Write an enzyme that holds these catalytic residues in place. Structure first.
Site, short mmCIF file in Angstrom:
data_model
loop_
_atom_site.label_atom_id
_atom_site.label_comp_id
_atom_site.label_asym_id
_atom_site.label_seq_id
_atom_site.Cartn_x
_atom_site.Cartn_y
_atom_site.Cartn_z
N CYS A 150 0.83 -1.20 0.00
CA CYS A 150 0.00 0.00 0.00
C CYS A 150 0.87 1.26 0.00
CB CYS A 150 -0.93 0.01 1.22
SG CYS A 150 -2.61 -0.55 0.86
N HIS A 169 5.49 -8.16 -4.14
CA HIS A 169 5.36 -7.88 -2.71
C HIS A 169 6.30 -6.76 -2.29
CE1 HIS A 169 5.22 -8.25 1.60
NE2 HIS A 169 6.47 -8.68 1.65
N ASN A 201 3.83 -3.69 6.60
CA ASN A 201 3.41 -3.71 5.21
C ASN A 201 1.90 -3.90 5.09
OD1 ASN A 201 3.50 -5.92 2.41
ND2 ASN A 201 3.73 -3.68 2.35
#
Length: 171
Positions: free
Chosen positions: A14, A119, A134
């Site tokens: 994000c 990722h 995260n």
């Protein structure tokens, strides 16, 4: 530990969560960051397809814009780096001669950012202990300096993307 932002959400990498957590507080919106990234990607896509004649094309291309997949492949290093640059923080690729040039130690680093195939990972320094978080995470991950050096070392020696964030932060 009543100062660390605790929260659990479903997602993957994000922009707002990374910036908000990195700054140790809410200092950016998800909609604003989303729009900024969309524009950067679109502008880079049109400028790239139409070609270009200037160093900008080299740097822009080298940065490796756009992504490949979804979930985590939404934002871009250009957007993140930009938001950090305006604040005074600069990203340094461990694989690049810049990281080795200054020879900035891991435990002595202020802000760290890990990038894994599909990722992302945000690491920040907190006093004497490191803090990881995260969008895919549900809680703060506390790590020691002695373990951080080896932790990241294993990633670089394996096949991951370790970015060094140095500069002046608000918190």
């Amino acid at each position: 530990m009543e100062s660390i932002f605790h929260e659990k959400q479903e997602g993957s990498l994000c922009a707002q969560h990374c910036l908000n957590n990195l700054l140790q507080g809410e200092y950016f919106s998800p909609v604003e960051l989303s729009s900024i990234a969309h524009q950067l990607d679109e502008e880079e896509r049109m400028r790239m397809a139409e070609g270009g004649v200037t160093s900008e094309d080299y740097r822009t291309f080298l940065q490796q814009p756009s992504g490949n997949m979804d979930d985590s492949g939404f934002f871009s290093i250009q957007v993140i780096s930009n938001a950090l640059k305006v604040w005074g923080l600069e990203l340094i690729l461990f694989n690049s001669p810049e990281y080795q040039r200054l020879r900035i130690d891991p435990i002595n680093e202020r802000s760290f950012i890990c990038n894994y195939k599909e990722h992302w990972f945000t690491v920040r320094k907190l006093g004497k202990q490191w803090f990881n978080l995260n969008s895919l995470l549900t809680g703060p991950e506390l790590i020691s300096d002695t373990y951080l050096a080896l932790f990241l070392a294993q990633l670089q020696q394996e096949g991951y993307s370790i970015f060094v964030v140095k500069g002046d932060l608000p918190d």
